[PDB]
Amino acid sequence: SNAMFSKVNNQKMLEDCFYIRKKVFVEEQGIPEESEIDEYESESIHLIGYDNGQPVATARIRPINETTVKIERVAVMKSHRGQGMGRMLMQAVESLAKDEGFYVATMNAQCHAIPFYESLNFKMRGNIFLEEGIEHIEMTKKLT
Amino acid sequence: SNAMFSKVNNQKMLEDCFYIRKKVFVEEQGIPEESEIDEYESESIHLIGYDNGQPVATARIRPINETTVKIERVAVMKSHRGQGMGRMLMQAVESLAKDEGFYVATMNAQCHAIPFYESLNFKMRGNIFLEEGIEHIEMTKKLT
Amino acid sequence: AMFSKVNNQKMLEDCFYIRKKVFVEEQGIPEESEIDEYESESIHLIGYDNGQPVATARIRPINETTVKIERVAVMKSHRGQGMGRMLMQAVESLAKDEGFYVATMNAQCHAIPFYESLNFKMRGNIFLEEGIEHIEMTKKLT
Ligand SMILES: CC(C)(COP(=O)(O)OP(=O)(O)OC[C@H]1O[C@@H](n2cnc3c(N)ncnc32)[C@H](O)[C@@H]1OP(=O)(O)O)[C@@H](O)C(=O)NCCC(=O)NCCS
Ligand SMILES: CC(C)(COP(=O)(O)OP(=O)(O)OC[C@H]1O[C@@H](n2cnc3c(N)ncnc32)[C@H](O)[C@@H]1OP(=O)(O)O)[C@@H](O)C(=O)NCCC(=O)NCCS
Ligand SMILES: CC(C)(COP(=O)(O)OP(=O)(O)OC[C@H]1O[C@@H](n2cnc3c(N)ncnc32)[C@H](O)[C@@H]1OP(=O)(O)O)[C@@H](O)C(=O)NCCC(=O)NCCS
Ligand SMILES: CC(C)(COP(=O)(O)OP(=O)(O)OC[C@H]1O[C@@H](n2cnc3c(N)ncnc32)[C@H](O)[C@@H]1OP(=O)(O)O)[C@@H](O)C(=O)NCCC(=O)NCCS
Ligand SMILES: CC(C)(COP(=O)(O)OP(=O)(O)OC[C@H]1O[C@@H](n2cnc3c(N)ncnc32)[C@H](O)[C@@H]1OP(=O)(O)O)[C@@H](O)C(=O)NCCC(=O)NCCS
Numbered sequence: 001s002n003a004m005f006s007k008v009n010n011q012k013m014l015e016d017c018f019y020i021r022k023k024v025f026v027e028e029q030g031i032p033e034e035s036e037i038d039e040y041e042s043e044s045i046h047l048i049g050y051d052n053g054q055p056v057a058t059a060r061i062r063p064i065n066e067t068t069v070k071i072e073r074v075a076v077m078k079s080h081r082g083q084g085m086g087r088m089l090m091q092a093v094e095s096l097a098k099d100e101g102f103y104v105a106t107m108n109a110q111c112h113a114i115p116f117y118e119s120l121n122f123k124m125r126g127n128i129f130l131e132e133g134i135e136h137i138e139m140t141k142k143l144t
Numbered sequence: 145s146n147a148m149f150s151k152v153n154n155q156k157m158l159e160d161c162f163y164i165r166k167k168v169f170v171e172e173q174g175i176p177e178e179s180e181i182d183e184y185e186s187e188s189i190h191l192i193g194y195d196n197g198q199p200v201a202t203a204r205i206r207p208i209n210e211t212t213v214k215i216e217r218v219a220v221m222k223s224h225r226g227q228g229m230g231r232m233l234m235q236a237v238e239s240l241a242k243d244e245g246f247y248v249a250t251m252n253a254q255c256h257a258i259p260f261y262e263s264l265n266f267k268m269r270g271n272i273f274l275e276e277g278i279e280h281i282e283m284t285k286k287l288t
Numbered sequence: 289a290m291f292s293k294v295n296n297q298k299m300l301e302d303c304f305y306i307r308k309k310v311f312v313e314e315q316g317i318p319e320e321s322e323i324d325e326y327e328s329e330s331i332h333l334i335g336y337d338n339g340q341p342v343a344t345a346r347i348r349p350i351n352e353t354t355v356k357i358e359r360v361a362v363m364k365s366h367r368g369q370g371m372g373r374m375l376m377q378a379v380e381s382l383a384k385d386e387g388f389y390v391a392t393m394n395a396q397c398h399a400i401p402f403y404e405s406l407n408f409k410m411r412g413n414i415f416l417e418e419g420i421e422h423i424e425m426t427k428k429l430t
């Protein structure tokens with residue numbers, strides 16, 4: 001099903017997520033480092049993918065109510081992009097969110113990723129908006 | 145006949161666009177003639193509208209990345225304004241941009257045209273700015 | 289000379305780098321707790337060697353007269369050569385320059401002799417935070 005990805009269940013795995021997120025969002029994309037980790041890590045559910053014992057992909061699922069999750073921090077290390085890992089990650093995210101009892105997902109997608117997310121049957125909603133100098137649009141999907 | 149909007153795919157059709165642009169932006173709005181035609185004509189995608197065989201409306205779509213276009217040079221000949229032609233033009237622009245594989249549009253709209261563009265579900269972003277003595281504001285929309 | 293007041297994002301992230309290496313990786317502070325909501329209001333110091341960040345601390349005002357000294361760290365590679373002492377001298381000087389009069393700190397107990405050599409004094413009793421023994425230490429700024 002989703003064999004390369006695991007639900008984070010200890011601190012080491014969580015810090016592996018943080019490592020990827022710092023490399024991608026902070027170092028590569030210029031998100032201020034102090035903003036990368038927020039007050040929602042504990043309430044969120046995290047996924048991690050490893051390759052050869054090295055953390056290479058992560059996302060988090062943040063419940064906003066009883067039915068709906070926000071998908072956040074979607075990242076694949078640059079070294080491992082373009083080989084289907086992001087797609088596998090997102091498939092694992094959807095499956096995990098459904099397993100955890102949710103029905104709907106929303107995400108503030110970076111605009112460069114729109115075609116990728118459309119291929120996963122997410123749909124744009126609303127209008128574009130800048131956060132941290134990056135263009136985004138909300139995208140949504142029911143979880144199946 | 146209906147007005148017909150077509151993707152420019154030869155030099156004569158492009159010249160029809162330039163004709164409208166010179167009449168509207170240069171002669172009517174005072175844009176310096178040497179600035180009307182720029183170095184982005186070939187990379188942009190142009191639309192021409194004909195009515196009774198005469199060029200009456202144009203715009204260009206300028207890709208800025210894989211997902212996003214800048215809408216530029218939006219003009220209807222003065223003779224044909226106030227009868228829905230601008231609306232039809234913009235609908236044809238949006239459709240062409242989507243057909244060409246884009247997802248989002250941005251535009252530096254002249255402020256006098258804000259209500260026109262709001263009627264097409266564009267939304268203002270940022271703040272106003274002067275170019276060529278004319279007030280503008282950025283406006284954006286997802287393409288559907 | 290060695291230490292500069294942090295005045296841009298790059299310098300601040302250099303502080304964060306040292307703090308992660310020392311407090312998180314070495315001392316086991318949970319990574320999500322390293323950076324807090326007080327980074328903006330605090331004043332930070334950074335020291336470099338070979339063009340690389342090697343020492344940091346922050347000064348966090350708690351009222352008009354008093355600062356908390358926090359995040360005092362020297363990379364393991366550069367310890368035992370007087371850099372921590374220089375850092376703390378720079379912290380005191382900066383805090384005084386910034387208009388403060390007194391400093392308090394929740395010192396890790398292993399550092400008590402280091403801080404006593406800088407004329408800090410213990411107050412109160414010991415307490416555990418993140419599995420590490422601490423004691424409050426204080427000094428007037430001169
Ligand atoms: C509070 C929080 C939980 C939701 O914030 P929000 O305003 O409702 O949603 P946004 O998606 O627009 O997030 C923008 C905020 O997150 C912060 N942020 C942290 N990491 C970010 C990232 N990778 N990309 C963008 N913004 C990020 C920004 O600094 C901004 O905070 P601010 O409002 O204090 O300026 C936020 O901390 C967060 O996690 N944002 C999501 C960032 C993210 O993961 N983006 C990738 C989506 S796959
Ligand atoms: C978005 C991201 C997670 C995708 O991960 P990935 O491992 O490259 O993804 P995949 O290999 O599974 O490719 C998924 C799709 O992305 C697009 N894509 C990937 N590599 C691409 C490339 N070199 N050129 C163009 N599009 C590309 C394609 O649409 C691709 O689909 P396909 O394989 O069916 O053709 C990754 O690029 C990333 O982490 N980017 C930086 C962080 C970020 O922006 N995250 C999004 C926050 S909302
Ligand atoms: C380089 C270019 C591609 C983008 O420029 P930009 O600075 O990113 O965007 P702006 O929309 O603010 O354009 C202002 C520039 O375009 C030029 N320009 C050409 N035709 C113009 C027009 N109809 N209205 C305003 N500026 C025009 C101005 O002289 C100015 O050039 P400069 O910076 O060398 O002085 C520019 O040549 C262009 O095409 N601008 C868009 C003009 C336009 O079509 N306006 C109507 C939008 S519906
Ligand atoms: C701006 C322009 C393209 C609009 O085209 P148009 O043919 O006049 O507009 P339309 O007749 O299609 O109008 C579409 C709708 O917007 C409304 N609208 C158009 N211009 C408006 C204005 N200035 N104020 C308020 N509403 C306006 C119309 O009333 C119509 O709504 P309706 O169905 O209620 O009647 C045209 O006036 C033009 O070419 N102007 C000169 C060049 C220019 O300024 N271009 C814009 C560069 S960003
Ligand atoms: C909120 C804050 C500003 C003050 O907290 P405080 O309770 O008044 O003071 P303490 O010195 O006892 O700090 C303990 C708290 O800081 C957190 N913390 C962050 N980095 C730490 C570190 N290096 N050492 C110890 N605790 C640390 C702990 O998780 C604990 O948080 P909690 O109460 O939510 O569990 C705190 O975020 C902080 O910065 N603490 C100082 C940590 C530090 O720099 N220690 C070295 C002193 S030289």
Ligand SMILES: CC(C)(COP(=O)(O)OP(=O)(O)OC[C@H]1O[C@@H](n2cnc3c(N)ncnc32)[C@H](O)[C@@H]1OP(=O)(O)O)[C@@H](O)C(=O)NCCC(=O)NCCS
Pocket residue numbers: 310359360361362363366367368369370371372373374394395396398399401402403405
């Ligand atoms: C504590 C720390 C900042 C000191 O920096 P440093 O570069 O090693 O310190 P210096 O070389 O300037 O001086 C070391 C001093 O430690 C003192 N010291 C430490 N343990 C001592 C002990 N058991 N007996 C006597 N002196 C002791 C001495 O006074 C020594 O000074 P000296 O050179 O005059 O003999 C550094 O070891 C560090 O970063 N440790 C890990 C992070 C940490 O625990 N920070 C404190 C949070 S409150």
Ligand SMILES: [Cl-]
Pocket residue numbers: 017018021046047058059060073
């Ligand atoms: Cl995560």
Ligand SMILES: [Cl-]
Pocket residue numbers: 161162165190191202203204217
């Ligand atoms: Cl054109």
Ligand SMILES: [Cl-]
Pocket residue numbers: 303304307332333344345346359
């Ligand atoms: Cl610091």
